[PDB]
Ligand binder design. Sequence first.
Ligand SMILES: Nc1ncnc(Nc2ccccc2)n1
Length: 131
Amino acid sequence: NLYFQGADSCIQFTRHASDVLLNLNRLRSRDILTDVVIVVSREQFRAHKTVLMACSGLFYSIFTDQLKCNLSVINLDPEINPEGFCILLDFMYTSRLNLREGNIMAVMATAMYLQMEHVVDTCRKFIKASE
Ligand SMILES: Nc1ncnc(Nc2ccccc2)n1
């Protein structure tokens, strides 16, 4: 699965980016090279800082701060919904957002807190649709 693109007809691999995420998610599943624990409502989630900061303005802020980037444990606001966070973390590693009637408000609040603008805009659009 490859194709050509641009002024220099460079070869692009269609599945490369998704294959990288698949492999990063496999690392996460096996706890390989995870370098941070996120604590949400007394539940712990192991992850890779680079993936978190690639997806979230809040994590980008934290992990580019000279002081804060040395923490191996990051606590979130205790009002954040841990399912909401799990849904968003899974999205970071898969591109798949498991949005449902019963979780959309929690997901949207969590995505606001995490500064995940495209997810927030998507939640808003689904909410507007059901008004
Ligand atoms: N997480 C994960 N799982 C499986 N394989 C890899 N990387 C890899 C292994 C062999 C050849 C090419 C890539 N990463």
